[PDB]
Amino acid sequence: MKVSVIGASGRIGSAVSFLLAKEPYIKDLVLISREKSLNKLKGLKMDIYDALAGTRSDANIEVHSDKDLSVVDGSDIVIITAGVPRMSRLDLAKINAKIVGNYAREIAKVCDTKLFIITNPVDVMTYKALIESNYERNQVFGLGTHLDSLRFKVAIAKFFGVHIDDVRTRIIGEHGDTMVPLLSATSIGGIPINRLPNFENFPYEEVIDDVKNKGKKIIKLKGGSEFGPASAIINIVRCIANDEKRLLTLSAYLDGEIDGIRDVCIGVPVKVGKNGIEEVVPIKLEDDEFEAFRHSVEVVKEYCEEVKDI
Amino acid sequence: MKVSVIGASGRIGSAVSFLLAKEPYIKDLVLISREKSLNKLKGLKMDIYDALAGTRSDANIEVHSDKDLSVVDGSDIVIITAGVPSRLDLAKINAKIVGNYAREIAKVCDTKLFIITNPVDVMTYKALIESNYERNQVFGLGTHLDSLRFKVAIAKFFGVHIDDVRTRIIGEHGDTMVPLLSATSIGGIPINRLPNFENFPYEEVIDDVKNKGKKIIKLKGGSEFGPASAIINIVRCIANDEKRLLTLSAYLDGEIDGIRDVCIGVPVKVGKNGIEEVVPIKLEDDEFEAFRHSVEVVKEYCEEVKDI
Amino acid sequence: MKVSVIGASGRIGSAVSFLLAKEPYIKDLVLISREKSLNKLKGLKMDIYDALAGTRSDANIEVHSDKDLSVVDGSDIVIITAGVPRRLDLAKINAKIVGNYAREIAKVCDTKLFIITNPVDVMTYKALIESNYERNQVFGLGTHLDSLRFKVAIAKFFGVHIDDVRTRIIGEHGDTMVPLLSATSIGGIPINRLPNFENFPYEEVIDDVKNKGKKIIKLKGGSEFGPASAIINIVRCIANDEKRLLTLSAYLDGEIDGIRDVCIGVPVKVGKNGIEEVVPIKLEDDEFEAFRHSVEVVKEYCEEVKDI
Amino acid sequence: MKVSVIGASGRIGSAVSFLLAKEPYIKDLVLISREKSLNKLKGLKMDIYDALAGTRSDANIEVHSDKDLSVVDGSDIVIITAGVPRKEDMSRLDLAKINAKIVGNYAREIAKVCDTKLFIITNPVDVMTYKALIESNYERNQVFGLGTHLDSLRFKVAIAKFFGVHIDDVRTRIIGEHGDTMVPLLSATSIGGIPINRLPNFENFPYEEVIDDVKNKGKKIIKLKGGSEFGPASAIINIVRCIANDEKRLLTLSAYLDGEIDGIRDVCIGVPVKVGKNGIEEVVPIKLEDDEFEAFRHSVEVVKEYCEEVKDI
């Protein structure tokens, strides 16, 4: 497999590149940056190679500028982590829709691939990448409410005193304040947490608000999330690599699977495999959660229109 | 961690010895068998060693007989996979086997006993009584194996990676299972809230699970790799103190409806101290009743093999 | 990746199937046996599925007899473990088995043939000829396993992790082995330079490495976990195009001292396309002479089975 | 296992915390920082936790400051990545004097709390490891640094990218100082176990150029990206794994010598060390060639001079 990370010079880009080179199935890895940042990537290449030596891993890392994206040909996934530093949730959306749109257009002129969008707003940037690439919807997806579901997993596991991996929850909709945390998909060991001791003392609304404000807290404290997002990305790349056909949650295009909702890219239950988003699974939603998903689809559609012509 | 396997010459025993030797935490593995089978273990130690050479692993594998169980001293866990393949007959014969091994082990050291011998929910109770060990240290691999088989059948009907399925079965490792369809979820999403669940043949699936052990015994001769890997998950949770909610044959002292004096498959939080608590999950109505029925039948068998 | 295991009902074939399904790249695994063992395979498929559920792995296992080998088409690799277990007579018996299998596999598709049947060098040669496959596509697990056994012996005498040891044995998987002390290392450090090499019983250890197969057969009934894990390493090298310098039974076409028309254990670069290169390392005169003798006997046995 | 990373707010420290949290044997991870960097660690703990949610891992990350180091009590290892940024206007002696006080104060206060292993990453790593062993008054088997091992992995990268081989198939050793007095052991350099002198095309290996590159690779990574993080962090994890699972592996680390090599004593320098549950369990005295052994004597002499220069800091 060959994966090209556009934005490898950044925080998430560099972490994703190192974790990706370690991945056994990743043979070739193309690190793409703006020409000015290319030296930062040279030092990433060296650093990653050193880690590969101390990880019993190997990869052909390959550092290029963004000038000619023909270096991404043969790549099965092009992870776009490139984003301007932040200026509202709409303003950065116009700047980053410019960036992601140009990257998707040029990538599509060069080859056919799966575009993994990490730039924020991730649902709007995934929609912009799909629009400008003219790629089929199975090929363009963004890491969205999955990172939120991982932060939720942490909160639940720490409260219930279990290995973080034993918790498995799902949050759909916008990677933002209009999240739709599915408490019916929240379980420790496959057992719904409502049926577990002390769920009555679980501060769910506090925990969900904290989950919503965790990205901001990490920006304010360290300067931005890097390892959490990067690990979440390696999961998706591994699913695509080994055709694992897994029910995951990704920002993908809806075309009537869930309540006839179309013309948007939002967090949805999807079956990921070698062909990207193979199907948007229409999981049965409670009435209150389905309403919240409709609302997040409304806000995301408004934002998507504000950058459709960018 | 030092783990001793009693019955390593068997199907499950040899598979579990190879897998445990590969585990990084396992530093000392003590294989044990009847003297008449000790040579089969001497070969096993060799073959596993070569496997360790080709898996980047290392382990100090000692091979001994069951005549001096002092070799199990220092064993964090002792996995008893020893036993012969009439139900009350297998419970009585394997109860002599497991009870003797537990008594002798308890005279050597204070370890945790992982009973794999069948009837597992009864051999686990026999091990606990004949050891006098604290309840938290004796546990058995019961409904967990059945839950992995159910996991397979679901993951194939719904066309997902098996590991995206996560289910749970409680009660007896036997025809009185209590499968928790309310605790069956793909991606955390209950199957009841998933497309095509209507056409999921739950009843056929659970019946095939009930007899999958007998069908492997008929086709291959006995479950070897499935049971072994299931053992390694428990050994890992104990070694790394993962404090995970699993399902094991464990002693009940009233955590679930005052049910006591029974070792049965239950939700248990497992860590460095074996069974750390019997978590009383809120069961459904039909489920809790099939669980009291499984506790009833299992208590019958435990009585039938108490004077053994 | 799709791999077919021809001979999966066997001891080695079953361990190889369980480990191959557990691998993340193996998406399809086609287990093939004679009709008389097809049921044994359908319980292996079940048993492995149960392990895959307990190993967070998944795969699509397909069980078929050897009657119609069209079930192997699409395989990147076909691992032939089918073979009468254990001299020249065994070569003839298994040359018929391997020759017919390679003939019918080559009539079904073009694939890589990983040959485990013994005499592995001779059987790899017979597979190459009877399939008319390219020489980069046919290879066997030969002296690599001897090197892993030498690895165990060295690591134990020197008190180091088994994986810290790295040695090379070339030539035949047998009594014409050519152990290369010049390549035996610990941490990359040649063992001669290490402390206490003067006390290492090299000749006794190599004699033991040669007879280790015979001893595992006498004590347990045949090697399975060692050879299976070794096979996994080779399959993984192909599946990830690791381009690792390994030792495998491969066809020589003059890379080493103009030695040709033989499939013998040699240093090769394994990758996506199989034997990408036979690397002619600098062998001492003594080692090279032993390699020439080994090649001689292997060619004698290869001629004795040239029409079988 | 409980590992305390002092200096986790940095590049090496944060990378190492993330990897250690993922390690299955790490149950407690204590991240320590200056009081002005504690927020940078509370963001780190969160980020790593999210990573542990997406890596099927779990750990109890506790975030404290360097004021009270009674928080590291119970640690099997304390990895000190604390160090000053090497500004261009800083000599070797200047950074040695600056980081000798940092490492010495941390060693003294960590010893006042408990008895643990001190994994020194701060450069000059040999001199800092020596200062930490001295000011901790610990057993010499318990204090050890990451030195020529990283230079060895970089040599491995340069070898495996020249010979067209997987990186892990190359195994080489560099002993001596994590610096210009390095002693690369071409005797201990191999591919698949085959010494590389016995390999096709060793004639054209630019070994001397390669070694000068491996000697300046850290400086180049600093110039380009700002400092290595993943290389040293992964190497650190390898050492922690050998200690935790008692693998008894022959590694190369900065360790104290008490005569194992030609009566060379009173120096923490890069040497072959069998690492296990008890840190440096033996300094293995491998048979170095004459030129190699002279170069090692030289590296020891220079490192002893650096140590005398920071003996009273």
Ligand SMILES: NC(=O)C1=CN([C@@H]2O[C@H](COP(=O)(O)OP(=O)(O)OC[C@H]3O[C@@H](n4cnc5c(N)ncnc54)[C@H](OP(=O)(O)O)[C@@H]3O)[C@@H](O)[C@H]2O)C=CC1
């Ligand atoms: N929803 C999710 O899952 C998450 C999404 N994110 C998003 O991912 C992005 C990456 O953030 P992060 O990497 O942490 O921060 P960085 O700012 O460190 O990454 C910025 C990267 O984007 C590149 N870049 C900046 N401006 C432009 C431009 N005008 N044109 C092209 N490339 C440009 C930078 O190159 P240079 O080196 O020249 O600056 C650098 O490669 C952010 O947009 C962030 O919002 C963040 C966390 C989680």
Ligand SMILES: NC(=O)C1=CN([C@@H]2O[C@H](COP(=O)(O)OP(=O)(O)OC[C@H]3O[C@@H](n4cnc5c(N)ncnc54)[C@H](OP(=O)(O)O)[C@@H]3O)[C@@H](O)[C@H]2O)C=CC1
């Ligand atoms: N808990 C679970 O989910 C499962 C448990 N099992 C149970 O575990 C046991 C092992 O099954 P399996 O290994 O597959 O079958 P095997 O018969 O292949 O293994 C038998 C093993 O038990 C030992 N053994 C047999 N009889 C005695 C005896 N009288 N005293 C002491 N040791 C003895 C044997 O030693 P020797 O070779 O010397 O006879 C050998 O080690 C069975 O009781 C089986 O029912 C099996 C599968 C599922």
Ligand SMILES: NC(=O)C1=CN([C@@H]2O[C@H](COP(=O)(O)OP(=O)(O)OC[C@H]3O[C@@H](n4cnc5c(N)ncnc54)[C@H](OP(=O)(O)O)[C@@H]3O)[C@@H](O)[C@H]2O)C=CC1
């Ligand atoms: N070089 C290596 O690394 C090693 C290679 N080996 C070799 O591999 C072979 C298998 O070893 P092992 O599995 O332990 O032996 P087993 O006897 O345990 O299994 C034999 C397997 O070979 C198949 N087989 C036997 N005879 C025939 C035949 N006439 N036609 C087709 N298939 C046949 C069997 O099918 P069925 O089940 O129907 O009988 C079964 O699949 C042996 O030849 C052995 O020498 C073994 C160890 C080390």
Ligand SMILES: NC(=O)C1=CN([C@@H]2O[C@H](COP(=O)(O)OP(=O)(O)OC[C@H]3O[C@@H](n4cnc5c(N)ncnc54)[C@H](OP(=O)(O)O)[C@@H]3O)[C@@H](O)[C@H]2O)C=CC1
């Ligand atoms: N042994 C090897 O091969 C390698 C060694 N290193 C060495 O390890 C150290 C860390 O490198 P790196 O993390 O990349 O550099 P950074 O500057 O990125 O991080 C420096 C770290 O050291 C801490 N620190 C700085 N000054 C002091 C002080 N006076 N007292 C206590 N803590 C302090 C910082 O905390 P704050 O946030 O307050 O600044 C921060 O945690 C350096 O000394 C470097 O030379 C690095 C790589 C390889």
Ligand SMILES: [K+]
């Ligand atoms: K890789």
Ligand SMILES: [K+]
């Ligand atoms: K081990």
Ligand SMILES: [K+]
């Ligand atoms: K698989």
Ligand SMILES: [K+]
């Ligand atoms: K951990």
